[PDB]
Scaffold this active site. Structure first.
Site, mmCIF file in Angstrom:
data_model
loop_
_atom_site.group_PDB
_atom_site.id
_atom_site.type_symbol
_atom_site.label_atom_id
_atom_site.label_comp_id
_atom_site.label_asym_id
_atom_site.label_seq_id
_atom_site.Cartn_x
_atom_site.Cartn_y
_atom_site.Cartn_z
ATOM 1 C CE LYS A 1 22.169 43.268 44.664
ATOM 2 N NZ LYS A 1 21.738 42.217 43.683
ATOM 3 C CD1 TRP B 1 22.829 48.326 32.628
ATOM 4 C CD2 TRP B 1 23.176 49.583 34.450
ATOM 5 N NE1 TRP B 1 22.557 49.634 32.293
ATOM 6 C CE2 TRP B 1 22.749 50.422 33.399
ATOM 7 C CE3 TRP B 1 23.450 50.149 35.707
ATOM 8 C CZ2 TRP B 1 22.598 51.804 33.563
ATOM 9 C CZ3 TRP B 1 23.303 51.515 35.870
ATOM 10 C CH2 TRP B 1 22.876 52.329 34.805
ATOM 11 C CB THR C 1 34.499 37.097 39.464
ATOM 12 O OG1 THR C 1 34.949 36.529 40.699
ATOM 13 C CG2 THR C 1 35.297 38.369 39.228
ATOM 14 C CG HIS C 2 30.219 39.309 43.177
ATOM 15 N ND1 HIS C 2 29.955 40.392 42.362
ATOM 16 C CD2 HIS C 2 29.043 38.662 43.328
ATOM 17 C CE1 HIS C 2 28.680 40.377 42.013
ATOM 18 N NE2 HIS C 2 28.102 39.338 42.592
ATOM 19 C CB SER D 1 21.601 47.441 46.370
ATOM 20 O OG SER D 1 21.304 46.468 45.386
HETATM 21 N N1 LIG Z 1 19.676 48.360 33.690
HETATM 22 C C1 LIG Z 1 19.860 48.793 34.948
HETATM 23 N N2 LIG Z 1 19.941 50.102 35.235
HETATM 24 C C2 LIG Z 1 20.111 50.537 36.498
HETATM 25 N N3 LIG Z 1 20.229 49.732 37.573
HETATM 26 C C3 LIG Z 1 20.147 48.395 37.378
HETATM 27 C C4 LIG Z 1 19.963 47.837 36.045
HETATM 28 N N4 LIG Z 1 19.922 46.501 36.130
HETATM 29 C C5 LIG Z 1 20.063 46.224 37.445
HETATM 30 N N5 LIG Z 1 20.191 47.351 38.182
HETATM 31 C C6 LIG Z 1 20.373 47.477 39.634
HETATM 32 O O1 LIG Z 1 21.649 46.958 39.985
HETATM 33 C C7 LIG Z 1 21.566 46.363 41.289
HETATM 34 C C8 LIG Z 1 21.930 44.884 41.220
HETATM 35 O O2 LIG Z 1 23.344 44.810 41.057
HETATM 36 P P1 LIG Z 1 24.068 43.421 40.692
HETATM 37 O O3 LIG Z 1 23.612 43.114 39.284
HETATM 38 O O4 LIG Z 1 25.525 43.814 40.801
HETATM 39 O O5 LIG Z 1 23.624 42.400 41.703
HETATM 40 C C9 LIG Z 1 20.138 46.590 41.771
HETATM 41 O O6 LIG Z 1 20.147 47.860 42.439
HETATM 42 P P2 LIG Z 1 19.019 48.328 43.501
HETATM 43 O O7 LIG Z 1 18.847 47.220 44.513
HETATM 44 O O8 LIG Z 1 19.621 49.584 44.088
HETATM 45 O O9 LIG Z 1 17.772 48.593 42.687
HETATM 46 C C10 LIG Z 1 19.392 46.645 40.451
HETATM 47 O O10 LIG Z 1 18.072 47.194 40.486
#
Ligand SMILES: Nc1ncnc2c1ncn2[C@@H]1O[C@H](COP(=O)(O)O)[C@@H](OP(=O)(O)O)[C@H]1O
Length: 288
Positions: A43, A48, A102-103, A133
């Site tokens: 999260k 992204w 990876t996590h 999140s």
């Molecule tokens: N382009 C972007 N810009 C900002 N936040 C993004 C994004 N794409 C995904 N996220 C946010 O990154 C988190 C998911 O993380 P991961 O990809 O590591 O699982 C989510 O946070 P939130 O739940 O706070 O909205 C998601 O909405």
């Protein structure tokens, strides 16, 4: 039912039962010298940054980046679920140059990454926003155990009794690891504040020099407003049994500071006191 099971210890870390079951494939994973590993605590901006990297590799070509869902373009290496997915298989069959997600905590990463001296991009996000999140993600992403109430989940998170273990140790040990291997250590909050600056850091780290116009294409397509609606990036292609977006969308809010909406003042004060004890000796610093 492959879903909603209790986590299983792997080398001290709670992982999904099916990852534990197939750990041999993960530990023996064969990396390649030109692999780029995107490593995150859950999260923290994985999707992204994965989209940014795929955009870079495709010179900002949005259509090429829609060739498949993000989780197929950038496989989640250790995620193996019977009848559903095998990240290791997906990567074994992927032509170089591979982008790998990876996590895993540092100590569980397959040793081949070290032996191949791979470049790694690590993304960290402030702990309070991560736990919020992660709570909603636990609800929608059915491979996880039931999170329970927010209060219950917050306590589990503080105790590290969540998938992939404690956030505190994850970010601290990956930070220390930057002295041993080439790790570009990024912060979600920095990407929120100045995404162009952060993408330029990624480009430099990758030894890529691209035109301004291509950089701007990459910036545009990696914004939350674009990614949220992009079915190749927003996880809506997942089987409903695996992710139910009606519970909570994967692309949920995409901000920094949502913790204020979730934490009570008492929970916040308790979390901070605990945080200081766990983090005060690390040179790592975060904005919330
Ligand atoms: N382009 C972007 N810009 C900002 N936040 C993004 C994004 N794409 C995904 N996220 C946010 O990154 C988190 C998911 O993380 P991961 O990809 O590591 O699982 C989510 O946070 P939130 O739940 O706070 O909205 C998601 O909405």
């Amino acid at each position: 039912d492959v879903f909603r099971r209790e986590l299983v210890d792997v080398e001290g870390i709670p992982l999904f039962w099916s990852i534990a079951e197939h750990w041999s494939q993960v530990e023996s994973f064969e990396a390649r010298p030109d692999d780029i590993l995107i490593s995150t605590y859950p999260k923290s901006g994985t999707t992204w940054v994965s989209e940014i990297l795929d955009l870079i590799y495709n010179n900002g070509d949005a259509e090429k980046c829609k060739r498949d869902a993000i989780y197929k373009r950038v496989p989640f290496m250790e995620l193996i679920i019977p009848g559903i997915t095998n990240g290791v298989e997906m990567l074994n069959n992927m032509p170089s140059p591979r982008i790998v997600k990876t996590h895993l905590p540092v100590q569980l990463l397959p040793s081949s990454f070290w032996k191949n001296d791979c470049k790694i991009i690590y993304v960290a996000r402030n702990a309070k926003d991560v736990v919020v999140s992660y709570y909603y993600f636990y609800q929608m992403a059915k491979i996880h155990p039931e999170p329970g109430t927010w209060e219950e989940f917050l306590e589990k998170f503080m105790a590290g009794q969540v998938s992939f273990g404690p956030w505190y140790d994850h970010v601290k040990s990956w930070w220390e690891k930057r002295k041993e291997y080439r790790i570009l250590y990024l912060f979600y909050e920095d990407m929120k504040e100045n995404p162009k600056c952060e993408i330029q850091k990624i480009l430099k780290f990758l030894e890529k020099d691209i035109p301004e116009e291509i950089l701007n294409k990459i910036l545009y397509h990696s914004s939350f407003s674009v990614m949220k609606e992009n079915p190749s990036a927003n996880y809506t292609t997942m089987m409903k049994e695996e992710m139910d977006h009606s519970v909570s969308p994967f692309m949920r809010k995409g901000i920094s500071g949502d913790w204020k909406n979730q934490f009570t003042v008492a929970q916040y004060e308790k979390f901070e006191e605990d945080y200081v004890k766990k983090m005060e000796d690390s040179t790592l610093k975060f904005r919330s």
